[PDB]
Design an enzyme around this catalytic site. Structure first.
Site, mmCIF file in Angstrom:
data_model
loop_
_atom_site.group_PDB
_atom_site.id
_atom_site.type_symbol
_atom_site.label_atom_id
_atom_site.label_comp_id
_atom_site.label_asym_id
_atom_site.label_seq_id
_atom_site.Cartn_x
_atom_site.Cartn_y
_atom_site.Cartn_z
ATOM 1 C CB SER A 161 -0.923 -0.021 1.216
ATOM 2 O OG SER A 161 -0.175 -0.248 2.398
ATOM 3 C CE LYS B 52 -3.559 4.936 2.193
ATOM 4 N NZ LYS B 52 -4.405 3.756 1.891
#
Lengths: 197, 72, 72
Positions: free
Chosen positions: A101, A144
């Protein structure tokens, strides 16, 4: 209270040659993964460090070969992969999110350490790579981003494959955080690594 | 619903320079394999790195033989 | 008292070549983990000796990465 142990922004961290604060799906709290690596003009040899796995190795090699396809872009010498000691570290286990990721994070970190050029903090990033470097949409960039504002980081690199979900992002997040808009990896490396020159 | 995840489909998904999708009945049983090229101007070599068993190595080498036989 | 069970002073304890004063905080007391490493020409394989775990080996390679940055 006590004595400050953290900073108002990571410009106080004074941009580092290793990594620029790769965002993370760290489930206990989205870290700023300084995925630092080894690099010096020399032999050319890939390996691992930091209890890593091979998912991270294939993403690392995919980014490293995008760099091999984009050698002229970042000031890399005509042979660099077979001229630099590659020993890759991740601080948080093998991977906090199973899957790469934070793939463009060590893409940048590799590019930074190969170039010996600091990738600037106060700008954090996240995203996966193909080996063509078409930046696939990672799952839930809201994670994020929420971590990035939780570290006070305001400029975030995210894909054109994720500009679809960029407008779904919450309102307080959308104006606290502007989002740098990329589709490939060369413009990640020109947005974030303006201190590559 | 949420926004379209993938791009509009492969009649208008633009033809990729490198990636050839392909057929495979893996544990997902139906996918599109994404095949790269590390086309770096360098020493010049070939290895089928990545999560590849040797039978995939044989198939790639085998139709690779057709490609090297039909290169121009 | 009796015979001195330790040295009169830790101000001088014969400064050796490869003794590394380990300032850990042990459970029962605070110790000096005076660990040793000895240099030899070899093969490059970092020997995982003396009950190394997961982060100790990569800390050793972290050391040698910095040393590789700073061999002089």
């Amino acid at each position: 209270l006590g004595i400050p142990r953290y900073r108002p922004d990571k410009a106080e961290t004074e941009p580092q040659v290793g990594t620029a604060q790769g965002l993370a799906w760290t489930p206990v709290g989205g870290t700023l993964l300084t995925i630092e690596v080894a690099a010096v003009p020399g032999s050319g040899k890939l390996s691992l460090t930091g209890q890593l796995g091979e998912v991270m190795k294939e993403s690392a090699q995919a980014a490293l070969t995008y760099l091999r396809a984009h050698t002229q872009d970042y000031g890399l010498p005509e042979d660099f992969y077979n001229k630099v000691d590659l020993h890759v570290h991740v601080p948080d286990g093998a991977t906090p999110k199973d899957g790469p990721s934070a793939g463009i994070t060590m893409a940048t970190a590799i590019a930074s350490a190969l170039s010996r050029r600091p990738a600037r903090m106060d700008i954090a990033m996240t995203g996966e790579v193909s080996l063509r470097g078409k930046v696939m949409p990672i799952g839930g960039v809201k994670e994020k981003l929420l971590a990035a504002h939780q570290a006070g980081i305001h400029k975030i690199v995210l894909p054109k494959d994720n500009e679809a979900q960029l407008e779904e992002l919450p309102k307080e997040v959308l104006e606290g955080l502007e989002i740098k808009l990329v589709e490939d990896v060369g413009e990640v490396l020109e947005y974030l690594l303006l201190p590559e020159p």
